[PDB]
Design a protein around this ligand. Structure first.
Ligand SMILES: N=[N+]=NC[C@H]1O[C@@H](n2c(SCC(=O)NCCS)nc3c(N)ncnc32)[C@H](O)[C@@H]1O
Length: 342
């Protein structure tokens, strides 16, 4: 077995000639030559079995990606692990090798309006399929948008996903922790558990804004700062929008704030396509009930060059873990990965 920076990759003999790509809290990513398909691939080594939460996220990722089949969602080509549960300490997920991701790309590259439009279309096309399966991604951000050398875009990392549950979405003030901070909708801090599809649309709007300027639009410095940045640009919510917040602690917090004017999108983004900014405004709408939904976004004039509902497929059947000990989760991961044995 070849090693990569102290990490053994028991991926042979099919996968050889490894190179380090990235690393995580219990995972490392490498590129490797697939000796069967005669192409280099990406492989992530996961070692989740000592920690229940890691097992949860691993099972979610595997179960969702194995059930989804869509051009704008990363597929799992192969899963490598030991032949028995007793011997299984690591799991290796094999995917198509993607040149970069949108986070890395935006560090150094400005995007043409044509690339912004194409990327946004692909994000929303993939998200339509996700949402049609009654799944919420719940952590959309540039680093979870993979890109290959021809700028095909594929959504990845479903470890934080959930089945939508809008009837149980309401909660109290300053309790919830959904998505990555900069991409987190205002209602997460106010009264939402992040169980409705509108959480993902907000994140896409944040990504669109970031594509327009290469800077995060709402760069909160910590959890409590995030609402400051959102309200600093959107301005004070209307009476109607406040009336939709029945929770008194959340509503009274907003009422306690001084009046703030909206910052016009075209002053923040003076180079941007006006249709892009119209769509941005509809995705970054404060009230989640008024926020545009994924199929409306696909139909927006900004995306008219690409929009084709007959070529924007949905899932064949929707999905319809917190209490399970890590031993049961390991057994489920073993069972879910059996199809690749061997
Ligand atoms: N460490 N870490 N993670 C972040 C780094 O790894 C890169 N990355 C990922 S992360 C999604 C995942 O866990 N996939 C499981 C199979 S690798 N997928 C990639 C892919 N398919 N092709 C090329 N690079 C990929 C990501 O762009 C960053 O460089």
């Amino acid at each position: 077995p070849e090693m990569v920076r102290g990490q053994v990759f028991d991926v042979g003999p099919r996968y050889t000639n490894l190179s380090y790509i990235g690393e995580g809290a219990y995972g490392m990513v490498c590129s490797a030559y697939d000796n069967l398909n005669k192409v280099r691939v990406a492989i992530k080594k996961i070692s989740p079995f000592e920690h229940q939460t890691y097992c949860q996220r691993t099972l979610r990722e595997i179960k969702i990606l194995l059930r989804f089949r869509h051009e704008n969602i990363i597929g799992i080509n192969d899963i490598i692990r030991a032949p028995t549960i007793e011997q299984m300490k690591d799991v290796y997920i094999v995917q198509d090798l993607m040149e970069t991701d949108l986070y890395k790309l935006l560090k150094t590259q400005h995007l043409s309006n044509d690339h912004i439009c194409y990327f946004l279309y692909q994000i929303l096309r993939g998200l339509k399929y996700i949402h049609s399966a009654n799944v919420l991604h719940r952590d959309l951000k540039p680093s979870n948008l993979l890109l290959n050398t021809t700028c095909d875009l594929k959504i990845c990392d479903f470890g934080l996903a959930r089945v939508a549950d809008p009837d149980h979405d309401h909660t109290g003030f300053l309790t919830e922790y959904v998505a990555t901070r900069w991409y987190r909708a205002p209602e997460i801090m106010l009264n939402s558990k992040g169980y409705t599809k509108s959480i993902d649309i907000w994140s896409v709007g944040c990504i669109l804004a970031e594509m327009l300027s290469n800077r995060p639009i709402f760069p909160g410095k910590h959890y409590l700062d995030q609402l400051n940045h959102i309200l600093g640009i959107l301005g004070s919510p209307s009476q109607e929008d406040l009336n939709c917040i029945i929770n008194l602690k959340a509503r009274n917090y907003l009422l306690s704030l001084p009046h703030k004017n909206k910052v016009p999108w075209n002053r923040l983004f003076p180079n941007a396509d006006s249709k892009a900014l119209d769509l941005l405004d509809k995705m970054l709408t404060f009230n989640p009930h008024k926020r545009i939904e994924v199929e409306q976004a696909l139909a927006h004039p900004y995306l008219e060059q690409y929009y084709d509902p007959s070529d924007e497929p949905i899932a064949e059947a929707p999905f319809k873990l917190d209490d399970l000990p890590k031993e049961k989760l390991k057994e489920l991961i073993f069972e879910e990965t059996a199809r690749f044995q061997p």
